[PDB]
Amino acid sequence: HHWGYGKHNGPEHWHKDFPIAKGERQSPVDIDTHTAKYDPSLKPLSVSYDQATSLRILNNGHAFNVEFDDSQDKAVLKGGPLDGTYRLIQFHFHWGSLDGQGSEHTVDKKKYAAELHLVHWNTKYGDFGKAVQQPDGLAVLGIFLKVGSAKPGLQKVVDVLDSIKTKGKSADFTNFDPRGLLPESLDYWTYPGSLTTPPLLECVTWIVLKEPISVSSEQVLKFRKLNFNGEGEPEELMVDNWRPAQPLKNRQIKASFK
Ligand SMILES: O=C(O)/C=C/c1ccc(Cl)cc1Cl
Ligand code: NA
Ligand code: NA
Ligand SMILES: [Zn+2]
Numbered sequence: 001h002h003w004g005y006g007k008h009n010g011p012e013h014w015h016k017d018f019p020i021a022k023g024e025r026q027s028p029v030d031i032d033t034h035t036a037k038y039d040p041s042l043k044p045l046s047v048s049y050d051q052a053t054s055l056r057i058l059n060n061g062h063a064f065n066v067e068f069d070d071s072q073d074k075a076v077l078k079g080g081p082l083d084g085t086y087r088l089i090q091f092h093f094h095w096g097s098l099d100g101q102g103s104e105h106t107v108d109k110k111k112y113a114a115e116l117h118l119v120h121w122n123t124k125y126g127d128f129g130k131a132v133q134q135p136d137g138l139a140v141l142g143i144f145l146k147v148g149s150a151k152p153g154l155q156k157v158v159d160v161l162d163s164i165k166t167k168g169k170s171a172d173f174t175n176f177d178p179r180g181l182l183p184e185s186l187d188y189w190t191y192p193g194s195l196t197t198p199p200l201l202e203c204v205t206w207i208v209l210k211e212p213i214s215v216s217s218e219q220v221l222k223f224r225k226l227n228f229n230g231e232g233e234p235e236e237l238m239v240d241n242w243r244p245a246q247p248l249k250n251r252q253i254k255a256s257f258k
Contacts, residue, residue: 001017001198003017003018003197003198004061004062004228005062005228005240005241005242006236011243011244014198014200017198018198018199018200020194020199020200020201020202021200023194023200023202024202024249024250025192025193025194025202025249025251026193026194026200026202026246026247026249027104027105027193027194027195027196027204027206027243027246028103028104028105028106028193028196028243028244028245028246029105029191029193029245029246029247029248029251029253030105030106030107030108030109030245030248031105031106031107031108031189031208031253032108032253033107033108034108035253036189036252036253036254036255037252037254037255038254038255038256038257038258039254039255039256042080042081042190042254042256043079043080043081044079044080045077045079045080045186045188045207045256046076046077046078046079046080047077047141047179047182047186048075048076048077048078049075049088049177049178049179050075051074051075052068052074052075052088052177052178052179053068053069053074053075053174054066054067054068054069054173054174054175054176054177054178055067055068055069055172055173055174056170056171056172056173057157057160057164057170057171057173058164058169058170059164059165059166059167059168059169059170059226059227059238060167060168061167061168061228061229061230062197062228062241063092063093063094063238063241064092064093064161064164064226065090065091065092066090066091066092066157066173066176066178067089067090067173068088068089068090068178070087070088070089070121070128073085073087073123074087074088075087075088075178076088076120076123077118077120077139077141077207080188080190080207080256081190081205081207081254082139082205082207083136084122084123084124085122085123085124086120086121086122086123086138086139087120087121087123088118088119088120088178089119089120089121089128090119091116091117091118091119091178091181092116092117092119093114093115093116093117093145093223094114094115094117094196094241094242094243095113095114095115095145095220095223095224095239095240095241095242096111096113096114096239096240096242097224097237097239097240099113099147099217099220100113101113101240101242102114102115102145102240102242103115103144103145103242104142104196104242104243104244104245105142105144105206105208105245106245107144112144112145112146112212113145113146113147113215113220114144114145114215114220114223115142115143115144115145115242116142116143116144116145116181116213117140117141117142117196118140118141118142118143118178118181119138119140120138120139120140120141121137121138121139122134122136122137122138122139125137131203132195132199132201132203133201133203134203135192135202135203136203136205137203137204138195138203138204138205139204139205139207140204140205140206140207141207141208141209142206142207142208142209143181143182143183143208143209143212143213144208144209144212144213145212145213145214145215145220146212146213146214146215147214147215147216147217147220148214148215148216149214149216150214150215150216150218150219151180151181151213151214151215151216151219152180153177153179153180153181154180154181154215154219155219156176157176158219158222158223160173161222161223161225161226164226165225165226165227165231166227166229166230166231166233167227167228167229167230167231168230168231169231181213182209182213183209183211183212183213184211185209185210185211186209186256187209187210187211187255187256187257188207188208188209188210188255188256188257189206189207189208189210189253189254189255189256190205190206190207190208190253190254190256191206191251191252191253191254192204192205192206192251193205193206193251196242196243197243210257223238224237224238224239225237226238228241
């Protein structure tokens with residue numbers, strides 16, 4: 001497959017190789033704050049990242065992933081809408097060419113500069129590849145980035161980006177603490193959806209935090225200096241690696257807060 005984010009291989013094209021692109025529970029979506037309903041039955045969200053073991057950062061030609069050791073219950077997400085225990089496997093971002101776009105989810109059609117996805121898989125399915133074949137296989141914690149003050153806990157990420165400029169480059173990335181990427185509040189919206197890149201599988205419980213984090217214009221500028229291309233290929237800046245909002249169809253977005 002040769003999918004991407006350009007005119008010729010971008011989201012409008014994806015359905016030909018990945019027909020579930022036009023399915024019933026695709027992501028992202030617009031979150032209409034006046035239609036999402038507070039759900040008193042939602043349990044409290046539990047982000048348990050104290051024992052997280054980061055390993056490596058990889059430019060995969062679509063984003064950069066910070067990868068974790070998920071061979072045991074070291075960094076897990078539980079509670080909220082979730083039954084059981086979801087292990088952190090990786091995080092990555094989606095961002096724009098300009099500060100007015102980049103997020104995949106929108107809020108009342110508002111686009112943020114970027115969006116962080118912390119990807120977890122349901123440990124009842126044993127491995128990640130099995131989990132993505134299940135409707136409750138993944139939980140993705142989504143966090144909006146707005147441009148403002150620098151996020152100190154992001155700076156170790158931006159400083160390593162010079163070493164993974166092009167597709168297929170990786171760097172050691174141990175001892176990174178993903179707690180430094182969270183906002184203060186864990187108030188969230190939740191709905192059932194999908195991966196937002198091919199293969200677009202309908203396996204995700206989305207948990208999108210209401211409170212965005214602020215990053216500096218310098219920090220996001222360094223994201224936009226990455227490359228989609230491999231080394232020694234013509235330079236294509238890694239920008240606008242976001243899928244736009246998809247039809248809500250027969251789904252309700254629930255709020256954890258009033
Ligand atoms: O950008 C994303 O949100 C998609 C990430 C992703 C992409 C492919 C597969 Cl199999 C699994 C995952 Cl979690
Ligand atoms: Na983990
Ligand atoms: Na609205
Ligand atoms: Zn993502």
